[PDB]
Amino acid sequence: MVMNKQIVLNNYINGSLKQSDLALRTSTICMEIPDGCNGAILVKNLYLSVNPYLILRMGKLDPQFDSPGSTIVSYGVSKVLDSTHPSYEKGELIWGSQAGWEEYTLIQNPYNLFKIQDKDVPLSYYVGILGMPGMTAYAGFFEICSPKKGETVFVTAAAGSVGQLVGQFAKMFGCYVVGSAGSKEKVDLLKNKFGFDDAFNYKEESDYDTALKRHFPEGIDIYFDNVGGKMLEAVINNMRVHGRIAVCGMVSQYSLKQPEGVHNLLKLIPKQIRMQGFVVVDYYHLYPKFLEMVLPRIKEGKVTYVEDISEGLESAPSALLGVYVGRNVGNQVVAVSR
Amino acid sequence: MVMNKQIVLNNYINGSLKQSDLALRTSTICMEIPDGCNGAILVKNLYLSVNPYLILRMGKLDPQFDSPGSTIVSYGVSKVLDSTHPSYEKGELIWGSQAGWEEYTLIQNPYNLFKIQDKDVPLSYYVGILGMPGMTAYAGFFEICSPKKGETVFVTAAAGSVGQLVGQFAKMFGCYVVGSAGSKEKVDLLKNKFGFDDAFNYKEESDYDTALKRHFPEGIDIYFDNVGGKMLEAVINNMRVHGRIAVCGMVSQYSLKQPEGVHNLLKLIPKQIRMQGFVVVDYYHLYPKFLEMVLPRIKEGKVTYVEDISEGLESAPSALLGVYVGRNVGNQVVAVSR
């Protein structure tokens, strides 16, 4: 009864991303739920997330796998238009992992949806800090890395949707932190905006190992991995005993086949390194204690966050190549309406 | 006052082990402790352990590092001859990580020594099951891997000093287990002697990935890593979600420089793999609950174990190349006296 513009994929992304791999279509959708369909909500999407984890969802690996004609689904903000789930009614705002890259989405069995409880916060922050990215940074740091007071912490891609929060949580926790991003603009931004104890550009130093003792003569305890590759090789060579590595992303391998090899895995034994891959969805029962912790540190100016707004559905393809090659800054968020 | 024959190293072992790297010397030692030396024991060694972890101690890496003229020290059985530590007196037997590759060792500050409590068990088993190897297999399985009832378990080098126990503990725990060794004799031995649900030879199959779904069509949950290398690459490709990898050794890299690379580290995120390196010394406060668990399962024939005795101090160099190239079977133990 109303037209719905979807954004679909066109092939598994092994490497060399092309904008032709995203087919923008126009479909129909009824503005209310069909008969015999209880426990479902029809929503109008608003803001969608564009974080590196979606490129991993296109891997062509074994479960939860996204990838070509199927419609793209990820996190987003959506207004309930009609509902057969008594937890929701018209006009209510929510955010969850069931938002399609479309104007109107029919969610047939919502599970991890969280109520907006809107207050005065910008609505895009339930896609950034108050959504999956902030929940990812929180879960990856305190739950995985078991941080102790006054330990060395290091964050890759600290300009991304997750890293800019890992460093802020870690210094406010009470730890030495260093960040790494891929542009002069980001480095001093990461230095001036977030209070990072230090930062640098990883392609300025053509030798990762030399640059990591330049900032960590005492070794490193905690590593939040968003890049992987041979940067992960350099970290292991500098880890203190009983160090821990929370692996959230491996962006260096999204670009090309035959990913870079890691050869110093032997070091995991003599310095007893714990390395754990993780995804945010397994740590959603801790979102309450996450939010009430972030609640005060917002309006006192204690923490901050920034985005890269790209209004409209059509752009999303151009905004996805922005995070794929690293041209984006902060959090890539696309607006479909309002 | 009595001659003491030491065995020392000659160079860091990056690769290509040569027996010339072990210099057999003859030194002197007083048969009693010198004056002004409280809290020390002088011991006569008996049986020494020769497990793959000692080759790692020769790495040339950063702490606890063994390596060339310095005398080799590892686990062993020793009789207290004289003592200034009131916890020990003459004639008492113990075992710990402070046994030198010599006939008589002067231990100046014993810490992790454990009393023999001898009973009737063979004295070599406080170097095998009742010593570091059994404590390593126990700590690496139940503490690191958090095994649940009826999960898929896989053990590399299941003929080694540790793997032959990991599989026995795991099936008696209540789990499906598969082993991997490097000789026809070992495979059927591993099959007939230990009740392994299956086993194979890793160099019989010239493609590790193909052989691992041949035995695990359901995936793998737990991997006890004693080899590393590209066998670890194949395991990660077959791990179930939330799988865990306890890394005890990486023997494939002891042989050659430029160790084999692991490229599928990306898989750690979508299936949430926990990989942890570990050493036994950090889990010695659980040796009591280890021993009282093994206590019954010994003389009922429920568990077994085998060695590769090589009597005398002089051999130890020839016995060390046996585990370096894999020619040994079971547990390599050298006897220096009795």
Author numbering:
A (entry chain A), B (entry chain A): 1 to 62, 64 to 68, 71 to 341
Sentences from the paper on this structure:
Pulegone reductase is the key enzyme in the biosynthesis of menthol and is required for the stereoselective reduction of the Δ2,8 double bond of pulegone to produce the major intermediate menthone, thus determining the stereochemistry of menthol. Pulegone reductase is a double bond reductase (DBR) which belongs to the NADPH-dependent, medium-chain dehydrogenase/reductase (MDR) superfamily. In Mentha piperita, (−)-menthone is directly synthesized from (+)-pulegone through the reduction of C2–C8 alkene double bond catalyzed by (+)-pulegone reductase (EC number 1.3.1.81). Some DBRs in the MDR superfamily proteins have become important biotechnological tools for asymmetric synthesis due to their high stereoselectivity in the alkene double bond reduction. It has been reported that the reduction reaction proceeds through stereoselective transfer of a hydride from NADPH to the carbon of the substrate.
In this study, we characterized a novel (−)-pulegone reductase from Nepeta tenuifolia (NtPR), which can catalyze (−)-pulegone to (+)-menthone and (−)-isomenthone through our RNA-seq, bioinformatic analysis in combination with in vitro enzyme activity assay, and determined the structure of (+)-pulegone reductase from M. piperita (MpPR) by using X-ray crystallography, molecular modeling and docking, site-directed mutagenesis, molecular dynamics simulations, and biochemical analysis. Phylogenetic analysis revealed both NtPR and MpPR belong to the MDR superfamily, but they are present in two different clades. To investigate the structural basis and underlying mechanism of the stereoselectivity, we performed molecular docking, molecular dynamic simulation, site-directed mutagenesis analysis, and biochemical assays based on the crystal structure of MpPR. We identified and validated the critical residues in the crystal structure of MpPR involved in the binding of the substrate pulegone. We also further identified that residues Leu56, Val282, and Val284 determine the stereoselectivity of the substrate pulegone, and mainly contributes to the product stereoselectivity. We uncovered the key residues in the pulegone binding pockets of NtPR and MpPR, and illustrated that the hydrophobic interactions and potential steric hindrances may mainly contribute to their stereoselectivity toward substrates and products. This study not only deepens our understanding on the substrate and product selectivity of alkene reductases, but also provides a structural and mechanistic basis for the engineering and directed evolution of pulegone reductases, enabling the production of enantiomerically pure end-product in industry.
